Symmetry: C2
Subunit: 123 residues, 2 copies
């Protein structure tokens, strides 16, 4: 039973070192960011290989109609507040909220603005 | 059955009947079109930020019921990451959401229908059409 959705930065911290098993997942949106980071890195093949290994340990959730609907709502509400958030961060927030998941992030201030969204900082 | 993935602006053009050539072609192709859930997100955002959220939301719901909504999955994400990295290398970036639609389409072997096409024409393995 899934309890957490790890933000992209948390995935990176976990990989680089420098917690729960079976209860964690990522949005497919975070996978996209991870792939982009590896491929643009100095060692793309090696870093891509690492990501396949990371992904095999957690669930990757498809970004579905529910995730999209929550995201659209969040984006409209944020715009009203003058509260900017990254486009992908907004999608991860919506996905998490759509799934009743805790979003784990080292940016608890950025995701704090999404109403109905619980956050933890494992940094 | 699915052959096209409609970009967000094309959906809007279809809904508004402006330019009316898009809806014309939309009707030619019933049963062969879909959208990414990413586009649904953009559509919902547009409704909810408007002055009449409930009415515009209903419009989106009515439109979407006529086409398939595909979930943005691991393959879509992976093609997107790669497309994004390649555009970056070439120094020709595109909007954050647009590239996700491009990646979703390529991951599914679909034609992406869009009023741009210059932004995506160079993407290998990705076919594009303009209904404007």
């Amino acid at each position: 039973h899934l309890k957490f959705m790890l933000a992209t930065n948390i995935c990176i911290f976990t990989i680089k070192n420098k917690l729960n098993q079976g209860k964690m997942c990522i949005s497919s949106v975070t996978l996209m960011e991870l792939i982009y980071g590896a491929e643009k890195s100095q060692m793309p093949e090696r870093n891509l290989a690492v990501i396949e290994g990371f992904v095999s340990r957690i669930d990757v959730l498809d970004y579905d109609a529910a995730a999209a609907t929550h995201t659209g709502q969040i984006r409209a509400e944020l715009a009203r507040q003058g509260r900017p958030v990254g486009p992908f961060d907004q999608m991860i927030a919506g996905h998490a909220r759509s799934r009743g998941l805790i979003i784990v992030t080292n940016n608890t201030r950025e995701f704090e603005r999404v109403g109905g969204l619980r956050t933890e900082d494992w940094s």
